[PDB]
Design a protein around this ligand. Structure first.
Ligand SMILES: C[C@]12C[C@H](O)[C@H]3[C@@H](CCC4=CC(=O)CC[C@@]43C)[C@@H]1CC[C@@H]2C(=O)CO
Lengths: 221, 211
């Protein structure tokens, strides 16, 4: 029913500007106060901006300092946030929020749109197969991996055998290494099934429009 | 400015326990709200106006408090309650920093596995040695790397998964990243897990001059 759908997040260089949009459905958008709340990478939640139902009443959070402009087009059921002179501290997930009453709980939240402020440029990942090799295992189970290295920005999507190996998968949160992201994913299959049954990790990096499959082959020792 | 603090930052409890978490204000305010967030999704209104429950919230939850102190309470906690809970109130810029409620379960030792750098990575001049410590509990685990009999500390990055949604275990990767030239100057690589499930470490190792 009620839907809030944000858009317009992306990579922006420091000093730059960005407009975020929040398309509303399923309710009389013009009767409700709306807000933007952001969640920083440290998961801190900050009340960025508030706008009354008629667009005649507005508040900004303490560090916005005039660099943010909240607006709304009730005819097109859309909330906006203009952002300008962006700083690294403005990197966050930006959520559009609806207000319930005049104690200002936020009863509906959109999916969020991500805003990344840095000089880093979009970089496809390198993907490396992780076969045991010299570290061979001998149990009823074998664990294999893919190393996804050197991409920006987040996120990458990892699947195994196109999602057909779903159980026994651990894809670890990425970490910044040389100011680029790296993560690994592990998969555990019965040892009787590898290499007799192929195992492939599927890595997608939409921001670079890259797809790569790495077959996990036993090493040529 | 009026600011919120939350305690504890992290707690774990078995299902069936009473859970309480506290939201403190630097000066008196009223009509506190509480938002629930689980990984990968948006905050959800959970409690509002100090004590009203949002739609879909089980009666096991309750909100209470006044003045400078507020609390969220859960009777007979259930696994689905695991989430981060943030307090906020209509005059506050920064939400409380949240309480992360995690699920206690039986101790479990990690399954440990080590991977030499791939030949494809070596071709590019990098060398990552990857060690997986999978399906263990509690989250606190110590990973030690040893290279040719001497402990190594530089160049190690560790990454924990969120508590697993099915079995409440943790998993973590420990990755040792080296230049190809530094990797080629040593031979024995060891990844050791020390956890409270045993006094003896779990050890996985390889020699580079094999394979
Ligand atoms: C909380 C803020 C101050 C104040 O409390 C605001 C709130 C937005 C909603 C709102 C509307 C009103 O008509 C009464 C004040 C109030 C409920 C504001 C959002 C940003 C601002 C701050 O960040 C102040 O630190």
């Amino acid at each position: 029913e009620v839907q809030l759908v944000e858009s317009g997040g992306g990579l922006v260089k420091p000093g730059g500007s960005l407009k975020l949009s929040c398309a509303a459905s399923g309710f009389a958008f013009g009767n409700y106060d709306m807000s933007w709340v952001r969640q920083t990478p440290e998961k801190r939640l900050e009340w960025v901006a508030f706008i009354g139902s008629g667009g005649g009443r507005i508040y900004y959070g303490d560090t916005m300092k005039g660099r943010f402009t909240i607006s709304r087009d009730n005819a097109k059921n859309t909330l906006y946030l203009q952002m300008s002179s962006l700083k690294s501290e403005d990197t966050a997930m930006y959520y559009c929020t609806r207000h319930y009453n005049y104690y200002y709980s936020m009863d509906y939240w959109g999916q969020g749109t991500s805003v990344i402020v840095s000089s880093a440029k979009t970089t496809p990942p390198s993907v490396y197969p992780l076969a045991p090799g010299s570290a061979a295992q001998t149990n009823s189970m074998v664990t294999l991996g893919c190393l996804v290295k050197g991409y920006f920005p987040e996120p990458v999507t990892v699947t195994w055998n196109s999602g057909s190996l779903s159980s026994g998968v651990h894809t670890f949160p990425a970490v910044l290494q040389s100011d680029l992201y790296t993560l690994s994913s592990s998969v555990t299959v019965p040892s009787s099934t590898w290499p007799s049954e192929t195992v492939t990790c599927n890595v997608a990096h939409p921001a670079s429009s890259t797809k790569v499959d790495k077959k996990i082959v036993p090493r040529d020792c | 400015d009026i600011e919120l603090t939350q305690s504890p930052a992290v707690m774990s409890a078995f299902p069936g326990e009473e859970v309480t978490m506290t939201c403190s204000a630097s000066s008196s305010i009223n009509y506190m709200h509480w938002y629930q967030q689980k990984p990968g999704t948006s905050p959800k209104r959970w409690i509002y106006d100090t004590s009203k429950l949002a739609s879909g919230v089980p009666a096991r939850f309750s909100g209470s408090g006044s003045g400078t102190s507020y609390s969220l309470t859960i009777s007979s906690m259930e696994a689905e309650d695991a989430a981060t809970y943030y307090c906020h109130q209509r005059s506050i810029f920064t939400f409380g920093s949240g309480t992360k409620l995690e699920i206690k379960r039986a101790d479990a030792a990690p399954t440990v596995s080590i991977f030499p750098p791939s030949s494809e990575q070596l071709t590019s001049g990098g060398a990552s040695v990857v060690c997986f410590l999978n399906n263990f509990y509690p989250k606190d685990i110590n990973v030690k790397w040893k290279i040719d009999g001497s402990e190594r500390q530089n160049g190690v990055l560790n990454s924990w998964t969120d508590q697993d949604s099915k079995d409440s275990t943790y998993s973590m990767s420990s990755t040792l990243t080296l230049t190809k030239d530094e990797y080629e100057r040593h031979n024995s690589y060891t990844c050791e897990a020390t956890h409270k499930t045993s006094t003896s470490p779990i050890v996985k190792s390889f020699n580079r001059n094999e394979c």
